[PDB]
Design a protein around this ligand. Structure first.
Ligand code: HEM
Ligand code: HEM
Length: 152
């Protein structure tokens, strides 16, 4: 583990891609209001951003409703443009809220200037969903219970 900084971050949660304006989820344009609420209800806004002095970055976000979903896959898109690049993730912690299991998902980023695309199957919906996340509004001092993967 390396010298660096641990920030609090606010996750921008998007049903509609913030750069292209396109919705990839099969719900499409006519479902924007329910889709946006669904992303917001699933992914917590408060997150952790680790930046080592050497330049490595790890973003941890928290997913609610994990008892109802699965087959998580993630892609990175630097600058929010160009191709989606498949990326590994690690569950660094599990917790609980009023909906059951929560998962802390850690993903390495080439830059904070990055879109994360996620997809997963949702059991009660009987279909897979596609959404976008990105980190902003950095807070110098992280406050919360996520577990640091990278920096001391
Ligand atoms: C975060 C990603 C998600 C997106 C983008 C999303 C999107 C949507 C959309 C567009 C609909 C309208 C029906 C349809 O198009 O199939 C819907 C319905 C529904 N979703 Fe999701 N959803 C997400 C996550 C979840 C999760 C994790 C659950 C598990 C509890 C869930 C439970 C439901 C239920 C029960 C309905 C039908 C009831 C209703 O009309 O609201 N969703 N969702
Ligand atoms: C019996 C019917 C419903 C059920 C079981 C249900 C369940 C849920 C669940 C489990 C969540 C995830 C966040 C949380 O646990 O607090 C959620 C979020 C949400 N629901 Fe419902 N819901 C229902 C009806 C509705 C209706 C009628 C509306 C519209 C007035 C609505 C609007 C929203 C919105 C906007 C969110 C996102 C809130 C957030 O940002 O955390 N829901 N719902």
């Amino acid at each position: 583990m390396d010298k660096g900084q641990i920030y609090g971050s606010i996750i921008q949660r998007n049903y509609r891609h913030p750069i292209s304006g396109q919705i990839e989820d099969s719900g499409g344009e006519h479902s924007f209001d329910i889709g946006q609420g669904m992303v917001e209800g699933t992914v917590y806004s408060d997150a952790m951003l680790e930046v080592s002095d050497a330049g490595k970055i790890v973003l941890t976000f928290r997913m609610s409703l994990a008892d109802y979903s699965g087959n998580y896959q993630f892609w990175i898109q630097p600058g929010g443009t160009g191709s989606f690049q498949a990326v590994d993730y690690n569950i660094t912690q599990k917790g609980t809220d009023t909906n059951g299991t929560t998962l802390d998902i850690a993903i390495s980023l080439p830059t904070v200037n990055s879109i994360i695309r996620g997809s997963m199957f949702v059991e009660p919906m009987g279909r897979e969903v596609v959404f976008y996340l990105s980190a902003s509004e950095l807070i110098q001092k992280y406050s919360g219970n996520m577990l640091a993967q990278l920096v001391t």
